[PDB]
């Protein structure tokens, strides 16, 4: 298919606790104005990373 | 940051091997059209992610 954009991402500012549903991370990114978002681990912690077309 | 500009990652389409130096990354990345970049780890993978403002 098309050859795609390439994404960019920012954790998020809103998004509180352990991010388990990137649903809800995508939903929570909405209210900060990009597209889309997913959670993310480091080590013991999963945050929610909003994500764009860079 | 909060009183400064919003950023967002892109992981690098050109590094090879492991992000040593984000200098090198950063230098790297502008050949991308970004105008900074940094590695960070994931894993057991240390990798150089290309840096803007969102």
Same mark, same amino acid.
């Given at each position: ?23 809800? =991370?995508?939903? *929570? +990114? ?19 990373? =909003?994500?764009? *077309? +860079?």
């Amino acid at each position: 298919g098309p050859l795609g954009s390439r994404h960019c991402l920012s954790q998020s500012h809103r998004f509180k606790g352990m991010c388990v549903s990137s649903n809800n =991370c995508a939903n *929570v +990114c909405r209210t900060e104005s990009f597209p889309d978002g997913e959670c993310k681990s480091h080590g013991l912690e999963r945050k929610c990373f =909003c994500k764009k *077309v +860079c």
